[PDB]
């Protein structure tokens, strides 16, 4: 399955981060929405979460599944992390090729202030 | 159709069981049912003679312990490896 292959791809970097203890900015890209979360190193506590599924972000977007929606959601998640003082995270692409919407989200977060 | 007079075991374990089997009795268990299992102390010679019938392992035995009758089935039998003796009998409450 596609998602099984994606999980298999992601697991290595996820375990490396999980043992390193880095706060994790995990992305999740779908054909329509792109989700971003920042999660504690233990993995069982969601620090912040910004997604196109929610009205506050979506209402400023034409289509929720493209590079511009990704840039908007990355900007939002980075600003909320900076308001929670998260400051320094590490990027978990979750198997998605770091390119296109995922890369645009990453650059939006980097310019907003998240360090990775 | 067969009635088996049984008495309650006082001590369990390898030593007590081998003491029984030397003293011409043998341990048995009554499990199954909705209550805790009961360990009993059967009379080896009578039980061997009565199990000689092939319907012992088919009809519902009755066990008389402390006057209380228990209707059981013969579930499993452990036999001596090279003797016509019994070592243990599993009864199921029924």
């Amino acid at each position: 399955d596609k998602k099984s292959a994606r999980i298999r791809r992601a697991t290595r970097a996820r375990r490396k981060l999980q043992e390193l203890g880095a706060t994790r900015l995990v992305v999740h890209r779908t054909p329509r929405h792109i989700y971003a979360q920042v999660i504690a190193p233990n993995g069982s506590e969601v620090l912040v979460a910004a997604s196109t599924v929610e009205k506050a972000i979506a209402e400023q977007l034409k289509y929720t599944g493209n590079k511009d929606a990704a840039a908007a959601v990355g900007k939002a998640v980075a600003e909320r992390a900076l308001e929670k003082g998260i400051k320094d995270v590490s990027f978990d692409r979750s198997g998605f090729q770091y390119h296109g919407r995922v890369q645009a989200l990453a650059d939006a977060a980097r310019e907003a202030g998240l360090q990775f | 159709m067969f009635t088996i007079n049984a008495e309650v075991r006082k001590e369990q374990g390898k030593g007590a069981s081998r003491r029984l089997r030397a003293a011409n009795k043998f341990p048995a268990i009554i499990y199954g049912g909705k209550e805790a299992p009961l360990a009993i102390e059967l009379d080896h010679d009578k039980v061997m003679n009565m199990q000689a019938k092939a319907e012992f392992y088919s009809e519902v035995l009755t066990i008389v312990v402390d006057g209380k009758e228990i209707k059981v089935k013969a579930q499993d039998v452990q036999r001596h490896p090279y003797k016509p003796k019994l070592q243990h009998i599993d009864f199921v409450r029924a």
Binding site: - | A54, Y57, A74, D76, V77, P81, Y82
Partner: protein
Amino acid sequence: GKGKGNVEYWVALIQPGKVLYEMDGVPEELAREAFKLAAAKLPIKTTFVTKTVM
């Protein structure tokens, strides 16, 4: 010395209770006679056992 020996025959270690030979389709007395004849050729004490449900 000078190494181990060469394989000469094959055995099957027998412990008490092991049911060596089994037989079916014959009368019981003839089975007893046949088993007596067979046991006379073996170096281990034996006995005659029957089938039971359990």
